[PDB]
Amino acid sequence: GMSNKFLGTWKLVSSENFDDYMKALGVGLATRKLGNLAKPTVIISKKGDIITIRTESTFKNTEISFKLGQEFEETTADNRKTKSIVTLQRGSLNQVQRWDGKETTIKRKLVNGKMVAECKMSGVVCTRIYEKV
Ligand SMILES: CCCCCCCCCCCCCCCC(=O)O
Numbered sequence: 221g222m223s224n225k226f227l228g229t230w231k232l233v234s235s236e237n238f239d240d241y242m243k244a245l246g247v248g249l250a251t252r253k254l255g256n257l258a259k260p261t262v263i264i265s266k267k268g269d270i271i272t273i274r275t276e277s278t279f280k281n282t283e284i285s286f287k288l289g290q291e292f293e294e295t296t297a298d299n300r301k302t303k304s305i306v307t308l309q310r311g312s313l314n315q316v317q318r319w320d321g322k323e324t325t326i327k328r329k330l331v332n333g334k335m336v337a338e339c340k341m342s343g344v345v346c347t348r349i350y351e352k353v
Pocket residue numbers: 242247251254255258260275277279280296297298326337339348
């Protein structure tokens with residue numbers, strides 16, 4: 221299933237077009253000002269068939285535990301309450317979030333030993349790169 225190369229503790233090192241992505245989610249300015257300044261660290265772990273993705277930052281922390289391909293309630297860092305699913309496509313980890321008839325996706329794939337996360341919303345595209353510790 222999911223590559224054990226994902227398991228570990230990743231540190232963000234680059235964000236591209238994050239603001240426009242947050243605006244597309246309806247995030248207020250003042251909140252964005254801190255989001256753009258944030259440098260989260262992501263911890264991915266598994267217990268059996270359950271995967272957990274934790275996000276730690278000075279501003280907000282998050283955590284989702286899920287089985288692949290099974291819908292699950294999620295609370296995003298901007299406090300959206302979504303019905304999310306995580307799929308596996310060509311070794312990429314694709315998280316979708318549905319709420320209020322709106323929809324966003326966060327695709328996570330490994331590239332040359334780095335985790336790359338693409339966030340798409342209303343045509344906007346974010347690209348955040350993480351480095352293993
Ligand atoms: C995780 C930092 C929180 C920033 C402040 C909340 C506003 C943004 C909420 C949605 C961001 C989702 C992007 C996740 C991308 C990643 O894997 O780093």
